[PDB]
Amino acid sequence: QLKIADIADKYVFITGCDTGFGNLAARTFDKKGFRVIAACLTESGSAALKAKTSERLHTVLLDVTDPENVKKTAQWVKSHVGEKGLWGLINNAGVLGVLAPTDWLTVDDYREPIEVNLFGLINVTLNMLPLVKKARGRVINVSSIGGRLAFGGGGYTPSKYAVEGFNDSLRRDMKAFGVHVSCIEPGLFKTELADPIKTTEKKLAIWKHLSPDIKQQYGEGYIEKSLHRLKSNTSSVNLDLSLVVGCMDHALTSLFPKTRYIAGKDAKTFWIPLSHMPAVLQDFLLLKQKVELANPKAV
């Protein structure tokens, strides 16, 4: 490790710092000596993070889906960092949206994850990019193993796939300016993103208004038996969020940041390898646990 020098003079802007990876990142980089600009969705998330950190850290309220708030925040960063520019941008904010079988969904159900995870990431990136160029800095995009292998119906999968493609377009565009772009692909980690109970609640809301034929095909208590698989293999969710923040740290401080980081033991040894395999192999493995439908010929 030849690391960069003058960490103490470099600003890092992180989206989604109320909870999860982004909260830990803000705290970690603050203690490391970066000047953190921690964007938070909520006032109480902002106040808690500020109470736990040093005077070098600033919080800002940002909803990444509000283009006016994005532009104002970018103007604030620009005046604050001046001719240093912005060394790091971590695009971390994201949401799961509704996860359910594709045939239960409307197109509207896909919009929310795409708006936060893709469009919000793009708009933040585009508004901050002049500052990153100025610093010859680093853009870090948080994708997912779900951006390389599709885990289930709903907008989250397409959102993360799209982030992988944008990431690569951005990287090649930014090579000429000496800006590095890193994509981080975590496996499953215990955060506020996904919560089996909340996922089940969304499915029950949808069930209420599903067509009779769908309900006959899947069967009453399909959702109950679904919750009993989400639970029945929740023992392989990583608790150590520092595995992901450690990737962010390398992307920000190495003289040789990677183009892709994979976080989680199963992610690197199994999931990302499988993402290269054709459907015949993937489908066999992923369908193993899926709950049998009650009446699949009721079409």
Ligand X SMILES: NC(=O)c1ccc[n+]([C@@H]2O[C@H](COP(=O)([O-])OP(=O)(O)OC[C@H]3O[C@@H](n4cnc5c(N)ncnc54)[C@H](O)[C@@H]3O)[C@@H](O)[C@H]2O)c1
Binding site for ligand X (CB under 6 A): 15-22, 41, 45, 62-65, 92-95, 116-117, 120, 142, 144, 186, 188-189, 191-193
From the list ligand X, a second copy, none, partner contacted by residue 94 (C-beta under 5 to 8 A by kind): ligand X
- With respect to ligand X, which residue has the nearer C-beta, 20 or 137? 20
Rounded Cα–Cα distance for residues 46 and 187 (Å): 27
Query: Which one of residues 3, 31, 52, 172 is an interface residue with a second copy (CB under 8 A)?
Result: 172
- Does residue 195 sit in helix, strand or coil? coil
From the list a second copy, ligand X, none, partner contacted by residue 159 (C-beta under 5 to 8 A by kind): a second copy
Site for a second copy in 222-281 (CB under 8 A): 259-260, 276, 278-280
Query: Which one of residues 29, 34, 110, 271 is an interface residue with a second copy (CB under 8 A)?
Result: 110
* Residue 142 within binding range of a second copy, rule CB under 8 A: no
Rounded Cα–Cα distance for residues 124 and 184 (Å): 17
Rounded Cα–Cα distance for residues 15 and 36 (Å): 11
Which tokens is 289 given? 């646990």
175: β partners:
none
Bridge-based pairing of strands 35-40 and 11-14 is: parallel
Rounded Cα–Cα distance for residues 197 and 207 (Å): 15
Sign of the CA dihedral running 141, 146, 150, 153 = negative
* Binding stretches for a second copy (CB under 8 A): 67, 85, 101-103, 105-107, 110-111, 114, 118-119, 122-123, 125-126, 129-130, 133-134, 136, 147, 149-154, 157-178, 211, 213, 217, 259-260, 276, 278-280, 282-283, 286-287, 290, 292-293, 296, 299
Tell me which residues are annotated as active site. 156
